[PDB]
Write a protein that holds these residues in place. Structure first.
Motif, mmCIF file in Angstrom:
data_model
loop_
_atom_site.group_PDB
_atom_site.id
_atom_site.type_symbol
_atom_site.label_atom_id
_atom_site.label_comp_id
_atom_site.label_asym_id
_atom_site.label_seq_id
_atom_site.Cartn_x
_atom_site.Cartn_y
_atom_site.Cartn_z
ATOM 1 N N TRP A 2 11.658 13.744 3.296
ATOM 2 C CA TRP A 2 11.001 11.958 3.592
ATOM 3 C C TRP A 2 11.786 11.869 4.155
ATOM 4 O O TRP A 2 13.684 11.695 3.381
ATOM 5 C CB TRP A 2 11.579 12.430 1.235
ATOM 6 N N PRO A 3 11.239 10.959 4.627
ATOM 7 C CA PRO A 3 12.601 10.352 5.896
ATOM 8 C C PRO A 3 13.192 8.863 4.459
ATOM 9 O O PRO A 3 12.216 8.297 3.403
ATOM 10 C CB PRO A 3 11.663 9.238 6.527
ATOM 11 N N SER A 4 13.985 7.433 5.464
ATOM 12 C CA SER A 4 14.504 6.935 5.063
ATOM 13 C C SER A 4 13.599 6.105 5.356
ATOM 14 O O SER A 4 13.591 5.952 7.069
ATOM 15 C CB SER A 4 16.435 6.831 5.376
ATOM 16 N N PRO A 5 12.905 5.086 4.444
ATOM 17 C CA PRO A 5 12.268 3.863 5.439
ATOM 18 C C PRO A 5 13.203 3.388 6.120
ATOM 19 O O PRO A 5 14.217 2.722 5.760
ATOM 20 C CB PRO A 5 11.713 3.645 4.262
ATOM 21 N N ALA A 6 12.672 2.506 7.406
ATOM 22 C CA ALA A 6 13.437 1.109 7.797
ATOM 23 C C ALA A 6 13.010 -0.078 6.666
ATOM 24 O O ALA A 6 12.398 -0.246 5.617
ATOM 25 C CB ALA A 6 12.698 1.005 8.813
ATOM 26 N N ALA A 7 13.036 -1.756 7.386
ATOM 27 C CA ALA A 7 12.706 -2.346 6.732
ATOM 28 C C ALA A 7 11.188 -2.559 7.006
ATOM 29 O O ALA A 7 10.487 -2.096 8.012
ATOM 30 C CB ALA A 7 12.929 -4.150 7.675
ATOM 31 N N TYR A 8 10.692 -3.170 5.851
ATOM 32 C CA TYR A 8 9.361 -3.232 5.540
ATOM 33 C C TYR A 8 8.714 -4.373 6.022
ATOM 34 O O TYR A 8 9.113 -5.923 6.297
ATOM 35 C CB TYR A 8 9.115 -3.001 4.043
ATOM 36 N N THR A 9 7.329 -4.485 6.630
ATOM 37 C CA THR A 9 6.152 -5.818 6.850
ATOM 38 C C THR A 9 6.012 -5.606 5.754
ATOM 39 O O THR A 9 5.889 -5.398 4.983
ATOM 40 C CB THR A 9 5.217 -5.453 7.946
ATOM 41 N N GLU A 10 4.938 -6.856 5.638
ATOM 42 C CA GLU A 10 4.277 -7.466 5.052
ATOM 43 C C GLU A 10 2.962 -7.027 4.522
ATOM 44 O O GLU A 10 3.093 -6.397 3.725
ATOM 45 C CB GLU A 10 3.632 -9.004 5.327
ATOM 46 N N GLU A 11 2.070 -6.024 5.598
ATOM 47 C CA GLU A 11 1.490 -4.755 5.637
ATOM 48 C C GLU A 11 1.896 -3.781 4.600
ATOM 49 O O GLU A 11 1.068 -3.664 3.804
ATOM 50 C CB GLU A 11 0.986 -4.379 6.357
ATOM 51 N N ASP A 12 3.297 -3.314 4.662
ATOM 52 C CA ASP A 12 3.568 -2.552 3.755
ATOM 53 C C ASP A 12 4.149 -2.790 2.785
ATOM 54 O O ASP A 12 3.584 -2.123 1.237
ATOM 55 C CB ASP A 12 5.481 -2.471 4.902
ATOM 56 N N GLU A 13 3.790 -3.726 2.229
ATOM 57 C CA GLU A 13 4.915 -4.482 1.072
ATOM 58 C C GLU A 13 3.633 -4.702 0.404
ATOM 59 O O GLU A 13 3.537 -4.726 -0.710
ATOM 60 C CB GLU A 13 5.310 -5.737 1.147
ATOM 61 N N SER A 14 2.789 -5.111 0.665
ATOM 62 C CA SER A 14 0.690 -5.714 -0.085
ATOM 63 C C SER A 14 1.036 -4.045 -0.607
ATOM 64 O O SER A 14 0.303 -3.573 -1.310
ATOM 65 C CB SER A 14 0.103 -5.513 0.966
ATOM 66 N N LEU A 15 0.845 -3.147 0.126
ATOM 67 C CA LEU A 15 0.707 -1.163 0.248
ATOM 68 C C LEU A 15 1.600 -1.120 -1.506
ATOM 69 O O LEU A 15 1.509 -0.223 -2.412
ATOM 70 C CB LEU A 15 0.899 -0.256 0.631
ATOM 71 N N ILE A 16 3.356 -0.966 -0.660
ATOM 72 C CA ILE A 16 4.057 -0.783 -1.833
ATOM 73 C C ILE A 16 3.955 -1.640 -3.559
ATOM 74 O O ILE A 16 4.426 -0.985 -4.536
ATOM 75 C CB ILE A 16 5.241 -1.414 -1.090
ATOM 76 N N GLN A 17 3.573 -3.388 -3.197
ATOM 77 C CA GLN A 17 3.037 -3.745 -4.932
ATOM 78 C C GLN A 17 1.762 -3.077 -5.466
ATOM 79 O O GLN A 17 1.888 -3.325 -6.840
ATOM 80 C CB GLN A 17 2.942 -4.719 -4.161
ATOM 81 N N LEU A 18 1.009 -2.742 -4.518
ATOM 82 C CA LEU A 18 -0.121 -1.340 -5.874
ATOM 83 C C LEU A 18 0.064 -0.697 -5.760
ATOM 84 O O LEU A 18 -0.463 -0.408 -7.094
ATOM 85 C CB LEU A 18 -0.840 -1.814 -4.532
ATOM 86 N N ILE A 19 0.643 0.318 -5.023
ATOM 87 C CA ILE A 19 1.900 1.298 -5.974
ATOM 88 C C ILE A 19 2.842 0.845 -7.384
ATOM 89 O O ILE A 19 2.176 1.523 -8.081
ATOM 90 C CB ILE A 19 2.798 1.820 -5.086
ATOM 91 N N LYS A 20 3.182 0.028 -7.220
ATOM 92 C CA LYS A 20 4.867 -0.287 -8.309
ATOM 93 C C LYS A 20 3.332 -0.728 -9.175
ATOM 94 O O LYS A 20 4.031 -0.868 -10.762
ATOM 95 C CB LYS A 20 5.764 -1.346 -7.908
#
Ligand code: MET
Length: 521
Positions: free
Chosen positions: A381-399
């Motif tokens: 599991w790598p350590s993530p860098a900074a998130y884009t908006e597109e990244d966060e749209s997905l993260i929100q769906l998962i959350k």
């Protein structure tokens, strides 16, 4: 209040071998139980067999064998079938169990002492096959197996016969208003809603009293004697419903064997059932009779009754289909394809379409991508860098996914929970395709870290939520993802980011595929 989450299936008549319908009801019971275990709760899941009555006794007579031997042989068939279907049920109950009979007698005695049982007559139609009393409105004309004109139930199409017997009668008529109060005060207590509306409509019309005993001759003495009256036997359905109370009072050893019946149900903290799983065919017994018996006896009522769309030249063998397509896949299909309306396409063609479409392409391809050596070069599991908006749209769906799925599992509506998790899997695939992490290995390692981390964490959470549906395959997936056992359950682990970066993936194998595709022959 904190208690053991108690989930039951119906107990099945042992007049014939187990078949898909029995498996489906017990699967639903199993899935509910499993989800509550994954949440970290105490669970007691219950299934079994309904072995008394005229139906079963006359089936044993057809086979020309003693009811004792016949019922044990068929119950053996159930037990073996359920073991082979790989459930995680906590106890299998048989109504021929001596502890069960003790509980039936104590309950019966409470109804009598309460004044809700009197000696009367039933003069009316009866369906031996449904062990069900019917009014003249619920019977029509039809044919029997000898092709002769007869009467049949409107409910089930089974042959009916006129019964005129002195029977002990339960004062169900006196529980109309209290049942109506219960439905109205607990508008989630019967699921789905349209079956709740049916029950209320029926009870609004009025309730007749109910025969809860039968002359012993009619039953071939294959039933529980009425206490204080050896000429009568207890109605098979009163006997059958009590299994839920009996199960709630059995101490079970590691072997799965009953070793003790407690006097008082609170000692085991199971009763009343949090969820009774049933087929639509037996709604009246669970939503009208059972709560009336409980109300008379001074016992707490169940919380939910969920009635699925099945009925508890062509065959569909459960184990035969599992050997061919997989246990977890078969279980997914049954739960994905089947809503509460039950207008399901259970063909090979549709089964193959979902295996290839959802399990193979949506879930399986996703697991391989984020674990492969080509994309996850460092098997971790790598350590993530900074998130884009597109990244966060997905993260929100998962959350948001756990809160949404949790609600569906609790309705309970397992189909909706499954659709929601795959809604999120579809999005992750779309994200992966969008980000082309295969290209990023060269172009941008820092970006590849972020994309991969979000994907692994999306695959882990969706899989955690699908673990009750896919118990064995979820384990394989967690092994591949290298998710420590502590993180494979508990509500702490529904949270995004529970598995820290640096966690190493599990080992790989050359031929490894999660679900392999099948041709459309
Ligand atoms: C208390 S559940 C009884 C169900 C019944 N034995 C049936 O197969 O429909």
């Amino acid at each position: 209040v904190e208690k053991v989450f108690f989930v039951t299936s119906p107990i099945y008549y042992v007049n014939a071998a187990p078949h898909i319908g029995h498996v489906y009801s017990t699967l639903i019971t199993d899935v509910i139980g499993r989800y509550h275990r994954v949440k970290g709760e105490r669970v007691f899941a219950l299934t079994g067999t309904d072995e008394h009555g005229q139906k079963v006794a006359e089936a044993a007579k057809q086979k020309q064998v003693s009811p004792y031997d016949f019922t044990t042989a068929v119950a053996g068939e159930f037990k073996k079938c359920f073991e082979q279907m790989d459930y995680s049920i906590d106890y299998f109950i048989r109504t021929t169990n001596e502890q069960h009979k003790a509980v039936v007698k104590e309950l019966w005695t409470k109804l009598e002492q309460k004044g809700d049982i009197y000696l009367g007559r039933y003069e009316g139609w009866y369906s031996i096959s449904d062990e069900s009393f019917l009014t003249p409105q619920n019977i029509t004309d039809g044919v029997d197996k000898d092709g002769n004109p007869c009467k049949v139930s409107l409910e089930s199409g089974h042959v009916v016969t006129w019964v005129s017997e002195e029977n002990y009668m339960f004062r169900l008529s006196a529980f109309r208003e209290r049942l109506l109060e219960w439905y109205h005060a607990n508008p989630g207590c019967i699921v789905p809603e349209f079956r709740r509306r049916e029950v209320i409509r029926a009870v609004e019309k009025g309730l007749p009293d109910l025969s809860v005993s039968r002359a012993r001759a009619t039953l071939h003495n294959w039933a529980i004697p009425v206490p204080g009256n050896p000429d009568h036997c207890v109605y098979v359905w009163l006997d059958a419903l009590t299994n839920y109370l009996t199960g709630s009072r059995l101490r079970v050893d590691e072997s799965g064997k009953e070793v003790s019946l407690v006097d008082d149900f609170n000692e085991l903290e199971r009763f009343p059932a949090d969820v009774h799983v049933i087929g639509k065919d037996i709604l009246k017994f669970h939503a009208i009779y059972w709560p009336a018996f409980l109300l008379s006896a001074g016992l707490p009522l169940p919380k939910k009754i969920v009635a699925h769309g099945w009925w508890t030249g062509n065959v569909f063998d459960p184990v035969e289909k599992a050997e061919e397509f997989g246990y977890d896949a078969l279980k997914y299909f049954l739960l994905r394809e089947s809503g509460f309306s039950d207008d399901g396409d259970y063909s090979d063609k549709n089964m193959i379409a979902r295996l290839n479409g959802e399990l193979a392409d949506t879930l399986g391809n996703l697991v391989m991508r984020c674990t492969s050596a080509k994309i996850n070069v460092n098997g971790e599991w790598p350590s993530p860098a900074a998130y884009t908006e597109e990244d966060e749209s997905l993260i929100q769906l998962i959350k948001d996914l756990p809160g949404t799925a949790d609600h569906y599992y609790l309705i309970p509506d397992i189909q909706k929970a499954i659709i929601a998790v795959f809604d999120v899997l579809r999005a992750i695939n779309a994200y992966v395709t969008d980000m082309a992490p295969w290209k990023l290995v060269k172009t941008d390692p820092e970006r590849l870290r972020t994309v991969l981390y979000i994907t692994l964490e999306g695959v882990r959470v969706t899989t955690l939520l699908l673990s009750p549906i896919l118990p064995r395959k979820s384990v394989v997936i967690f092994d591949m993802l290298g998710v420590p056992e502590v993180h494979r359950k508990g509500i702490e682990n529904f949270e995004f980011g529970a598995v820290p970066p640096g966690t190493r993936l599990g080992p790989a194998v050359e031929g490894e595929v999660l679900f392999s595709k099948r041709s459309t022959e």
